[PDB]
Amino acid sequence: SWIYPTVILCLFGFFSMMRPSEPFLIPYLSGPDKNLTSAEITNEIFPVWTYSYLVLLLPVFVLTDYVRYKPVIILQGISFIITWLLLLFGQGVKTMQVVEFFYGMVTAAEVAYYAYIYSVVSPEHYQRVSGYCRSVTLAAYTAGSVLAQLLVSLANMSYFYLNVISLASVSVAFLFSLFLPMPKKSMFFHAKPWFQDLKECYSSKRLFYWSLWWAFATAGFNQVLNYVQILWDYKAPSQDSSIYNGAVEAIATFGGAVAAFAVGYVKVNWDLLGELALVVFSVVNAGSLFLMHYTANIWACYAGYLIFKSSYMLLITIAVFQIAVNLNVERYALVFGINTFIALVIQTIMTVIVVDQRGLNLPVSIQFLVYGSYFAVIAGIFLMRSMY
Numbered sequence: 001s002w003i004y005p006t007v008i009l010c011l012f013g014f015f016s017m018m019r020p021s022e023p024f025l026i027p028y029l030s031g032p033d034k035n036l037t038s039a040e041i042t043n044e045i046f047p048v049w050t051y052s053y054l055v056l057l058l059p060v061f062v063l064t065d066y067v068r069y070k071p072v073i074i075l076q077g078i079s080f081i082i083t084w085l086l087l088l089f090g091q092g093v094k095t096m097q098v099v100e101f102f103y104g105m106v107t108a109a110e111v112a113y114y115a116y117i118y119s120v121v122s123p124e125h126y127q128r129v130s131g132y133c134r135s136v137t138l139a140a141y142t143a144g145s146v147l148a149q150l151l152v153s154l155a156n157m158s159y160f161y162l163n164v165i166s167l168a169s170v171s172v173a174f175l176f177s178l179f180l181p182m183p184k185k186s187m188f189f190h191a192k193p194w195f196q197d198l199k200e201c202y203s204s205k206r207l208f209y210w211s212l213w214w215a216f217a218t219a220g221f222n223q224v225l226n227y228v229q230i231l232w233d234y235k236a237p238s239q240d241s242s243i244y245n246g247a248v249e250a251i252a253t254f255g256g257a258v259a260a261f262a263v264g265y266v267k268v269n270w271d272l273l274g275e276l277a278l279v280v281f282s283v284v285n286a287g288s289l290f291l292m293h294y295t296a297n298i299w300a301c302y303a304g305y306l307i308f309k310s311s312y313m314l315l316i317t318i319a320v321f322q323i324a325v326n327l328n329v330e331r332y333a334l335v336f337g338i339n340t341f342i343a344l345v346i347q348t349i350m351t352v353i354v355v356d357q358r359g360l361n362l363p364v365s366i367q368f369l370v371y372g373s374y375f376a377v378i379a380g381i382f383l384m385r386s387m388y
């Protein structure tokens with residue numbers, strides 16, 4: 001059968017991604033509860049996340065197939081508990097970097113969470129259970145941001161209690177994570193009957209350029225998803241007017257879900273339109289990031305994030321569809337693992353150069369000009385490849 005591990009995995013997926021304090025994190029740190037300047041948050045604290053998601057990406061896969069997918073989720077649950085407990089009680093510029101380290105390990109073990117599906121389930125429901133679990137996680141994050149902003153704007157709720165709610169939700173997620181079945185076989189190591197065949201994998205012109213774009217777009221979206229809240233804080237601090245972070249990130253994630261639903265139900269010639277459909281929405285992404293940089297009204301920057309996140313989820317779902325058709329299931333996770341490693345190398349290089357003190361030590365203003373130029377260079381590369 002398949003239904004019980006699906007139900008426990010979707011319960012873990014709902015109560016993990018219900019993090020109501022997640023949109024309001026940058027008003028929580030720079031707010032009156034802590035003594036943290038926004039220069040130290042922009043330039044010393046958040047880049048550690050990218051660092052911790054590079055150095056702990058490749059070992060976690062090694063600690064995924066060997067433990068056959070169960071205890072890495074339990075490590076993610078312990079990571080949840082440690083991260084939000086340190087968000088509750090932790091003080092200083094030193095402890096908040098440890099927070100970013102453990103949040104990097106959270107983002108690392110998310111891949112093992114998704115990879116448990118093809119390990120425990122009988123192969124008749126490889127399509128059904130994965131789409132179910134991903135939909136449950138997306139609905140969890142959307143409803144979490146909805147409940148967050150409603151409780152804040154209509155409940156006089158300080159942010160510390162919202163982190164308490166987040167701790168409780170990820171703690172309940174840790175209590176569901178223990179009650180999963182250890183699967184019978186893994187996907188690479190513990191299969192009872194690959195380096196030399198790996199050159200044959202990326203020897204495909206329909207699979208290299210799309211993977212390269214997935215890497216650059218994933219790095220850019222992780223950067224923008226990091227620093228968009230510090231940009232929102234810079235445009236209008238939380239002590240002036242009560243900003244609406246949870247509602248806008250909720251509508252943005254809902255639009256991302258609508259875009260991902262809209263990718264798989266449009267029947268046009270993909271090779272002919274794809275030399276244009278990538279280009280126009282890449283221009284949309286570049287214009288959205290430029291719009292968030294140049295503006296001074298806060299709803300204009302919110303609308304820039306809405307248009308950017310919907311356009312990214314559109315184009316990156318198109319990319320995931322244009323990779324997945326050719327290969328099998330076992331090669332799919334290896335290809336996306338190498339692609340994710342390349343994306344985090346690119347994001348680490350760009351975060352050392354642009355963001356951190358070892359590079360330029362930039363404020364959050366000029367940063368989004370650089371990220372908009374990065375996606376504009378991406379759109380120019382697509383325009384040049386259409387011109388070939």
Ligand SMILES: Cc1ncc(C[n+]2csc(CCO)c2C)c(N)n1
Nearest residue numbers: 022025046049099100103225226229
């Ligand atoms: C503890 C912690 N939380 C969030 C971020 C930044 N961040 C990563 S993803 C995301 C939104 C996901 O939809 C945000 C705001 C961070 N650096 N550390």
